[PDB]
Design a protein around this nucleic acid. Structure first.
Ligand SMILES: [Mg+2]
Lengths: 1321, 38, 537, 49
DNA sequence: CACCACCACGCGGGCGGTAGCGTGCTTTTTTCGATCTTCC
DNA sequence: GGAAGATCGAAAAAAGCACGCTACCGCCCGCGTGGTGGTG
RNA sequence: UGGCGGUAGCGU
């Protein structure tokens, strides 16, 4: 396979052994696909805006005279680009235009005749658009709408395992959760009676709903019970003998038939007698009369002679009642078949408990439960019952909801209605009864097949539907005002509800979270995040224990380790590498179909529900390259459990070893050698690393760095292939190839790299080119490196020479000893950018302005400020310095923006936003003119290319016609067009070319004018503010003691000392190590992947060192080729094959100079290098195989008694800096109510002496100290002043006084009707 | 340091010493073995 | 009063919410409407409705949402009533009376100070300067370098040279209270003597970390400055770290070596059989130290040295006894920090964690408190120094895996196959066969752990002068496990032997255990199974 | 911070704390069930004096 | 210069609607209608 | 020999749910009427 | 010159 241009620069050695069959898909596909489904036009109304419009429209007025219908919708082009939206602070959105038809019928003839049809296009708000990176730009800020893991709509049966009734009995219940509507629950009480609840309200007997459904008692008994006919023969009241009714009963009556005594009295029934009656096919059996008394009649029995009912339905029979029925002449009597364990009489008991006896009574009772206090009316009760579940406007069982409902009820139909029905409720209650009887099982609530995933598109569609129904109600009200003949559809609707709902969803939702821009890994993890804490879901406090557990169905869909450590553990998960979503919202994972033993290559995506049936093999299974498993007993999983299976019983094959883990977990080398907890911590802290000023590739990696870097939009990727026409530190111009040419286009791609722009975490975002002039490029090749990216590979940390040994207790528990060379080389130095805004508003007295001079200040203060009152760009500033000079009239008072205390840096960017109508200052004119110059430069380069082509064509025409090339080459270019040739078709084509040139110039100047007008169009602001000035300050943070640093295996720590270079341990060659780590951490925190990585790193560095030596001696290319080929060929059954014989003898030198700093190693997350491969690589580098060398003390110089582990490890600088945590206060501002010191670091505030600290002081003899904490330092203002004065004069004495908080509490209590006072006596 | 998640027909003598009985009333059976009626 | 319900300005032309003001306004509106209705001689229905609405408004002001639906403000949430500002965690009692924010306090991350004494803690210079500002002002005015206190601040914030001297003078004997965020017990806050350091991190003595339950991986501590004579006296006499030696919960000592001191003392107090300088006779511990520093004798050499030990008699003084003892060079060197009253039997052993704790307990019981503090500091210093000198390291070859473990695993597979075949025959039910499988897997894991431990503990077979000899191994993992510095039998067994049975979240035990070590490569199934227990914990 | 105010109510209103905080002080004092108490207070039934 | 557009504004309160909204915790106290009991 | 006393099971209501710290955003009436200023 | 709510993270 031929490597890409960016890959040939630095090929990473891969130690993977199992060939891959499915490439890693696009990481951000889950968001983009959902948004496309939301916004793309759909001929069928199933998803998105089209589906919402079809659900709402058409709109019918109150009277059948006029109507409004929807035809089509079109999303307009956004007014501002994504970068323009980010800079200006506006929301990236597109206008929504909808085609509406207003139809006015005939007043005289309402049968369907129409009078007027009016078509119009109306705007109904702006829909925010998702960028190419799956993010939203809301109010100029990047936001991510995470997916929500909620409960799928449908019917779910569960129970409590003895949680209630104190007896251990299970109370089964069933819930019908719709997508939009009311919740219906059927529960079993301790007394074995079925009850029904609506919206978790007061329960009612479960037969009330049946009665309200126009069902009589006889119909209910027929539906929910088996019927036995007690036909009255000449005597003995024989029945029909069904042997299945005699299973496991007490045979208190003599069972005889056909002269044979099958069973005698007092004999229990076992399988033998059941076999006997089954083989005898007995149908008529003599029955004692008393056996009738224990049964329950089924249907009402009336007397024909007297016209009166002998017996009603569903009550216990009696001797007198049966005698009266027999003497009445009813030779046929019906009864229920009820068993104590098989067919319980729950329905009959519920009916007996049920007080209602008619449909009207049941409806009235339902209305009374639903709306207490209101007068129950027949019409009101009927309307409420109809609208509860049988109306599309109130109840909506979604397509996935209907599918789950039918699957739970074992139905072959999937395309059902969105509303409930009598059959659905009857089947649900029958299933619950069967489950109670014993036939059936409860559903797993935490099962991933019972949980749905909602993405941004679904929630946006739901919010748009809410806004649409609000607008529909408004337009329904408006449409019935008459005089429709003179009104367009434009004024019928109002865009306020839709726009308000959209803004609330996209800006004020629990799932529209601030984008985490620490590094590309942070953004990737945030975008592929599933949170169960959204609206209509779980809560952080009442989550419980079971839901947070790792279900077996999480295999291949949810990362078992990537989860937050804290209150929301298990509630927030990360999508797996290969996991994707069904059309119904259920997660599915890929597998390889295994047919007749051999493993095929076709990929089937299996869901959680359907994966239980098949037996799925394992990725870590050895294959003989023929598709057959080398071992007969393969470890597989059948139904949520692991077991050994035969090689012919396997059904599916794992597609990869990274399928289980997510991207953050798969980025950790040697993960299988680390504890699960340590892997979790490493994955969590891998995305907290700030980017350094120099990206350093990981010496040991997993091969997923390229995918993470490319998929994240932090790097510039060539859209079309070609050659680098013009490379620069800020822009790249690529001349595209003729194959990818577009008609009527010059064919140049311009990439404007973002340089030093602050992120959401106040970090630095910078792009650096990695191409040169004339270098060919292809589609998908990287052109610039984003933050924490090196040559298209993710680079979160730096390679560090570490040594595992105790060093005088400076790495006691988890601390890190750092050499001074680390600070000298600025390896971990980072750049942080902070934005400060100065706001010039409109006041009642007058408008404040930004001006150069400031009252009552010296001249040196305004030295940094220009004549416009804004600090100079590039001017170094410190705490308290004036940034933007602003004054407010009272003559004026100081309101100028100042640098916060303890904040320094350099001003690198100033942005001025001016409201329309307000004059623009000199700085704003300068900024707009730089932007105009940049746009003009781009359009001008385009013009030069196009006009060069046109003039080449003109010269060719001239040389073909007049062959005056010698004269043409000595003339100004315009004269070529001005000159006229002889009168033929040549003159006509010359005139046509001149006209084309003129029209092209006109089009380009029109484009320039449009760009200039867009640049200075003028952005609006909040009501009351007329100007905004934002200043960006960039500062450099260097590594220092107290800063948090960690590896990829959860080995976090804090820098304890910056040791001098001469004091650090050194080897025989005299090279000191960079990091000293405590070995004591390894045995407890079981993360061996550290040491292995370290060893591997050493080997990698050794190889690089050798290459560097081969480069320092100016050796011939043949030796370098041979050595690099030998290094790449090292391994045992490695899938990667590198052939250096096809490198043209020049790319070899570039590869060698790239590898001279260390050959990168790719270690797959579960198919990595073994110890033998690492030892062989170390032997190739002429390093000890044990990985331990002999070190010497820097101070004393004596050799250490034992060899120590010295290698190279990837270190990460987490975003926990000591200068952001250190804080101290002696006396500052206080709260204006409680008179207590403020809280936080941004505002000068003191630490909180909480209740627990007070308890600790009380446990001591600390009495004066406690009084000092409570009164003289926090509340007592007079005490505070007296203590300050006494310390100033040198007296350490206190006056406790009276805390103000107690006075405030006393006043608050006295504000009620309660008197409280401090009595003196 | 605690936990929250919710997860004989004969008497064996291991040491050497006398045996004492407390709040016991018993009776000698047919075989002479003592059976306690407490 | 209005000041308790202020209408703060928003610096944009508008004001705050002030739900109390809104409720008062509603009550006033209802009262005024009712008064106007009464003055108009209203019919019964209208006055009844107005009175009911006024009563509801009064109830909402007194206790919003107590009876009916709570009044919703501009934020789509219930307004804060009078009762809401008294009760609850956010109420006045638990937020401004039982606990409150205090001046003269700061917060910063912690860092190990190995050079610090037991009563000392390292404080950043900037933090100390900010905290002790009034004291610096007072000292500057007393010594007369400034005329006004404004000049005092003007010398302070500019950081003149004399300001550091003043700050050093004012913190010479001024204790500071260090407290961790979870103050679970009494020892969560302790008094220390400040030592000015360069940086932004507070330096903490290692020996007090166990009292604080603090580790150096991002933890933060808060420092408070007592500013009265009484408070300084109780900080020095009650809250000082030297005073707290025994846990009030059970009386057990709280200051024990944990990680590196134990390892250093264990390495120093160990013996080989053929170390350099073995068998010589030394005049005392000083000669042993000189020989070790000169490289002539190894730290583990078994020699005979003359030592003098002091014993306490009935009258209370110390009587000396000089004798020749067979010991090691390291033990003789360590004897120089032991106080006089203690005997020599404490150091003439391997000196593990329990041995060090027992030696400290004996020193406390016999000598007192101050000698115990000095001994603890010297023990920590020596342990750190000799742990650094030892150069102990963890490597991939340290976790040796025995092949007998593989043979035992294969035999366990054979036994489980036999059990499965018996189950297929129908002679054993599912429950009993599962129990037998669990039992045999537990037995196999125990055998693997036993074989691995036997290999690890006595792997070192070294040659004496004439022939071979099997002694205690010097494997770094084994030394760490045996000395008690870090790790236990279970963790080392997981590292080198099989991980054993694992339990699925419902509580049951899976039939197939994790037969792969952490050194070896766990497959996807084993990692997925272990994630269940990890997530549960 | 210390000066308080007062409002003269046109009609008396029951204190919610002494009425709704179980056990009801007014109901216990009057020996009357709470339902009658807050159905009389909120103008739904008459009570004889 | 009576008609439209801008800002006070006033009382109003749950809002928007030709109605509901609510839906994954545990423990303690009240209470209230229904049921069995027992003696005046 | 049927209504107070005692029980009692279910329904409702109230109370609670660790500490310390860091960073960000979103919001802090209303609405829709009428008095009054501008105006074709 | 403050409060409320939501989100994410750190140390336990
Ligand atoms: Mg910690």
């Amino acid at each position: 396979m031929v490597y890409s241009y960016t890959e040939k620069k630095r090929i990473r050695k891969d130690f993977g052994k199992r060939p891959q069959v499915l490439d890693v898909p696009y990481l951000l596909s889950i968001q983009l696909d959902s948004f496309q489904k939301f916004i793309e036009q759909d001929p069928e109304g199933q998803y998105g805006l089209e589906a919402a419009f079809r659900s709402v429209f058409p709109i019918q007025s109150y009277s059948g005279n006029s109507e409004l219908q929807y035809v089509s919708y079109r999303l307009g082009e956004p007014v501002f680009d994504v970068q323009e939206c980010q800079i200006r602070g506006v929301t990236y959105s597109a206008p929504l235009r909808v085609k509406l038809r207003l139809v006015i019928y005939e007043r005289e003839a309402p049968e369907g005749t129409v009078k007027d049809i009016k078509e119009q296009e109306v705007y109904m708000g702006e829909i925010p658009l998702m960028t190419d990176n799956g993010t939203f730009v809301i109010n100029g800020t990047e936001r991510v709408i995470v997916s929500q893991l909620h409960r799928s709509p449908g019917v779910f049966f569960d129970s409590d395992k003895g949680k209630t009734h104190s007896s251990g009995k299970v109370l089964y219940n069933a819930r019908i959760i719709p997508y939009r509507g009311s919740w219906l629950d059927f529960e079993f009480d301790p007394k074995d009676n079925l009850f029904v609840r609506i919206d978790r309200r007061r329960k009612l007997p479960a037969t009330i709903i049946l009665r309200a459904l126009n069902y009589t008692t006889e119909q209910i008994l027929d539906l929910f019970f088996e019927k036995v006919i007690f036909e009255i023969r000449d005597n003995k009241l024989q029945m029909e003998l069904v042997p299945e009714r005699l299973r496991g009963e007490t045979a208190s009556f003599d069972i005889e038939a056909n002269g044979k005594v099958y069973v005698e009295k007092g004999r229990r029934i076992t399988a033998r007698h059941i076999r006997q009656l089954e083989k005898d096919d007995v149908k008529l059996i003599e029955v004692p009369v008393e056996y009738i008394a224990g049964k329950v009649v089924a249907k009402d029995y009336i007397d024909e002679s007297t016209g009166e009912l002998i017996c009603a339905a569903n009550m216990e029979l009696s001797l007198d009642l049966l005698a009266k029925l027999s003497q009445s002449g009813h030779k046929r009597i019906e009864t229920l078949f009820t068993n104590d364990l098989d067919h319980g009489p729950y329905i009959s008991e519920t009916l007996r408990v049920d007080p209602t006896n008619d449909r009207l009574s049941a409806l009235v009772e339902i209305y009374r439960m639903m709306r207490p206090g209101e007068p129950p009316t027949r019409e009101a009760a009927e309307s409420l019952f109809e609208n509860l579940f049988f109306s599309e406007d109130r109840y909506d069982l979604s397509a996935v909801g209907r599918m789950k409902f039918n699957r739970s009820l074992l139905r072959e139909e999937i395309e059902g209605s969105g509303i409930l029905s009598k059959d659905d409720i009857i089947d649900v209650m029958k299933k619950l009864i069967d489950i109670r009887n014993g036939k059936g099982e409860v559903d797993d609530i935490d099962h991933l097949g019972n949980r749905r995933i909602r993405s941004v598109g679904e929630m946006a569609e739901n919010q748009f539907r809410v806004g649409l129904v609000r607008v529909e109600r408004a337009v329904k009200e408006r449409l019935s005002l008459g005089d429709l003949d003179t009104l367009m559809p434009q004024d019928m609707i109002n865009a306020k509800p839709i726009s308000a709902a959209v803004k609330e969803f996209f800006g004020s939702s629990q799932l529209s979270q601030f984008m985490d821009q620490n590094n590309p890994l942070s953004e990737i993890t945030h975008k592929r995040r599933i949170s169960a804490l959204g609206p209509g879901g779980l809560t952080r406090e009442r989550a419980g224990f079971e839901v947070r557990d790792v279900h077996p169905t999480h295999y291949g869909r949810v990362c078992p380790i990537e989860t937050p450590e804290g209150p929301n553990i298990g509630l927030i998960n990360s999508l797996s590498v290969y996991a994707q979503t069904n059309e119904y919202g259920f997660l599915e994972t890929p597998y390889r179909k295994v047919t007749d033993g051999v493993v095929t290559d076709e990929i089937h995506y299996l869901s959680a529900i359907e994966e239980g049936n098949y037996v799925i093999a394992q990725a870590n299974s050895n294959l003989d390259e023929e598709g057959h498993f080398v071992e007969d007993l393969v470890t597989c999983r059948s139904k949520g459990e692991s077991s050994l299976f035969s090689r012919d019983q396997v059904d599916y094959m794992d597609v990869s070893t990274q399928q289980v883990v997510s991207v953050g977990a798969s980025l950790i080398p040697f993960l299988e050698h680390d504890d699960a907890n340590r892997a979790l911590m490493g994955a969590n802290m891998q995305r907290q690393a700030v980017p350094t000023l120099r990206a350093d590739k990981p010496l040991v990696g997993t091969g997923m760095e390229r995918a993470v870097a490319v998929d994240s939009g932090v790097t510039a990727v060539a859209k079309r292939g070609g050659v680098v026409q013009y490379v620069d530190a800020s822009r790249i111009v690529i001349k595209v190839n003729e194959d990818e040419m577009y008609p009527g286009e010059a064919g140049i791609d311009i990439y404007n790299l973002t340089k030093y722009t602050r992120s959401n975490q106040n970090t630095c975002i910078n792009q650096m080119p990695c191409v040169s002039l004339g270098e060919p490029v292809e589609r998908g090749d990287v052109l610039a490196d984003g933050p924490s990216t090196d040559l298209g590979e993710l680079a979160l940390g730096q390679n560090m020479r570490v040594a595992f040994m105790p060093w005088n207790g400076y790495n006691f528990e988890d601390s890190i000893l750092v050499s001074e060379r680390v600070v000298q080389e600025d390896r971990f130095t980072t750049i942080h950018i902070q934005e400060l805004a100065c706001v010039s508003r409109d006041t009642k007295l007058g408008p404040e302005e930004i001006t150069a001079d400031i009252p009552n200040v010296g001249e040196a203060a305004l030295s940094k400020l220009d004549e416009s009152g804004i600090v100079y760009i590039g001017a170094e500033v410190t705490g308290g310095d004036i940034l933007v000079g602003k004054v407010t009239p009272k003559d004026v008072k100081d309101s100028s923006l100042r640098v916060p205390n303890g904040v320094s840096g350099t001003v690198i960017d100033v942005q001025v936003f001016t409201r329309d109508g307000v004059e623009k200052d000199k700085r704003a004119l300068e900024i707009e003119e730089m932007q105009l110059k940049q746009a003009k430069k781009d359009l001008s380069e385009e013009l030069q290319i196009l006009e060069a082509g046109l003039f080449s064509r003109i010269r060719a025409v001239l040389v073909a016609g007049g062959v005056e090339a010698e004269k043409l080459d000595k003339l100004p270019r315009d004269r070529w067009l001005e000159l006229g040739l002889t009168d033929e078709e040549k003159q006509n084509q010359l005139e046509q070319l001149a006209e084309q040139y003129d029209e092209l110039k006109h089009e380009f100047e029109k484009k320039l004018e449009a760009k200039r007008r867009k640049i200075t169009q003028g952005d609006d602001l909040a009501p009351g503010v007329l100007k905004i000035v934002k200043v960006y300050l960039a500062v450099k943070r260097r590594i220092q003691p107290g800063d948090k640093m960690a590896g990829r295996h959860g080995n976090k720590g804090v820098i304890s000392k910056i040791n001098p270079i001469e004091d650090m341990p050194y080897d025989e060659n005299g090279t000191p190590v960079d990091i000293v780590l405590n070995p004591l951490g390894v045995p407890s925190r079981m993360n061996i992947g550290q040491i292995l990585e370290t060893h591997l790193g050493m080997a990698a560095k050794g190889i690089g060192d050798k290459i560097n030596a081969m480069l320092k001696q100016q050796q011939e290319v043949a030796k370098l080729r041979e050595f690099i080929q030998r290094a790449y060929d090292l391994g045992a059954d490695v899938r990667q094959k590198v052939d250096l014989s096809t490198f043209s003898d020049e790319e070899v030198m570039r590869l060698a100079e790239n590898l001279r700093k260390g050959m990168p190693i790719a270690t797959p997350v579960f198919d990595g290098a073994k110890e033998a491969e690492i030892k062989e690589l170390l032997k190739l580098g002429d390093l000890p195989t044990s990985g331990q060398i002999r070190l010497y003390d820097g101070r004393t110089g004596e050799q250490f008694e034992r060899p120590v582990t010295v290698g190279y490890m990837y270190m990460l600088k987490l975003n926990h800096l000591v200068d952001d945590k250190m804080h101290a206060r002696s006396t500052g501002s206080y709260s204006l109510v409680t008179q207590q010191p403020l809280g936080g670091k941004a505002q000068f505030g003191g630490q909180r002496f909480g209740e627990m600290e007070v308890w600790a002081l009380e446990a001591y003899g600390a009495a004066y100290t406690l009084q000092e904490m409570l009164t003289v330092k926090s509340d007592d203002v007079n005490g505070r002043t007296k203590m300050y004065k006494n310390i100033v004069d040198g007296n350490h004495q206190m006056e406790p006084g009276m805390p103000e908080s107690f006075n405030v509490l006393l006043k608050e209590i006295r504000s009620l009707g309660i008197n409280i006072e401090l009595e003196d006596e | 340091q605690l936990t929250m998640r919710t997860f004989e027909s004969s008497i064996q003598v291991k040491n050497k010493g006398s045996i004492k009985l407390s709040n016991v009333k018993s009776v000698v059976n047919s075989s002479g073995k003592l059976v306690i009626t407490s | 009063p209005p000041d308790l319900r202020p209408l703060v300005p928003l610096d944009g032309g508008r004001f705050a919410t002030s739900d109390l003001n809104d409720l008062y306004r509603r009550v006033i509106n209802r009262n005024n409407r009712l008064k106007r209705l009464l003055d108009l001689a209203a019919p019964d229905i209208i006055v009844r409705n107005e009175k009911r609405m006024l009563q509801e408004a009064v109830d909402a002001l007194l206790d919003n949402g107590r009876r009916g639906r709570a009044i919703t403000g501009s934020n789509k949430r219930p307004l804060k009533s009078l009762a809401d500002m008294i009760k609850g965690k956010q109420g006045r009692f638990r937020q401004n009376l039982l606990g409150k924010r205090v001046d003269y306090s700061g917060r910063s991350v912690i860092t190990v100070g190995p050079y610090l004494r037991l009563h000392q803690c390292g404080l950043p210079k900037k933090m100390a300067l900010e905290l002790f500002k009034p004291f610096i002002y007072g000292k500057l005015e007393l010594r007369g370098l400034a005329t006004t206190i404004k000049a005092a601040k003007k010398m302070v914030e500019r950081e003149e040279a004399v300001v550091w001297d003043i700050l050093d003078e004012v913190i010479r004997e001024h204790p500071v209270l260090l407290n961790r965020a979870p103050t679970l017990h009494r020892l969560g806050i302790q008094a220390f003597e400040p030592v000015l350091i360069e940086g932004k991190a507070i330096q903490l003595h290692p020996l007090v970390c166990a009292a604080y339950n603090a580790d150096f991986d991002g933890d933060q501590m808060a420092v408070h400055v007592p500013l009265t004579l009484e408070a300084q006296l109780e900080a020095r006499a009650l809250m000082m770290s030297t005073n707290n030696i025994l846990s009030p919960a059970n009386g057990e000592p709280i200051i024990v070596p944990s990680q590196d001191v134990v390892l250093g003392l264990y390495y120093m107090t160990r013996d080989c059989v053929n170390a350099k300088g073995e068998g010589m006779v030394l005049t005392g511990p000083k000669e042993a130290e000189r020989l070790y520093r000169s490289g002539l004798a190894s730290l583990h050499a078994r020699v005979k040295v003359r030592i003098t030990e002091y014993e306490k008699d009935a009258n209370g003084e110390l009587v000396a006894k000089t004798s020749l003892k067979d010991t090691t060079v390291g033990r003789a060197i360590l004897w120089m920090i032991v106080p006089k009253g203690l005997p020599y039997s404490i150091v003439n052993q391997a000196l593990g964690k329990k041995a060090i704790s027992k030696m400290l307990n004996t020193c406390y019981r016999i000598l007192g408190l101050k000698p115990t503090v000095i001994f603890a500091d010297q023990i920590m210093y020596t342990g750190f120094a000799y742990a650094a000198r030892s150069g102990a390291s963890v490597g991939i070859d340290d976790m040796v895996i025995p092949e007998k473990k593989h043979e035992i695993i294969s035999e366990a597979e054979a036994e489980v196959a036999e059990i499965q075949e018996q189950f297929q025959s129908g002679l054993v039910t599912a429950g009993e066969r599962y129990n037998k499988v669990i039992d045999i897997w537990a037995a196999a894991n125990d055998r693997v752990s036993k074989a691995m431990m036997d290999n690890l503990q006595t792997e070192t077979v070294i040659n004496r002068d004439g022939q071979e000899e099997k002694q205690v191994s010097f494997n770094s993992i084994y030394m760490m496990a045996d000395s008690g510095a870090r790790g236990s039998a279970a963790q080392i067994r997981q590292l080198a032997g099989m991980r054993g049975l694992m339990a699925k979240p419902d509580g049951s035990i899976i039939e197939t255990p994790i037969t792969a070590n952490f050194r070896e490569g766990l497959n996807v199934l084993q990692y997925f199974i272990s994630t269940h227990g990890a997530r549960k914990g | 911070r210390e000066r308080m105010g007062h409002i003269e109510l046109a009609s008396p209103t029951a204190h919610i704390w002494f009425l709704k905080s179980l056990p009801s002080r007014i109901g216990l004092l009057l020996d009357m069930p709470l339902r009658d108490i807050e159905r009389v207070l909120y103008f739904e039934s008459y009570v004889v004096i």
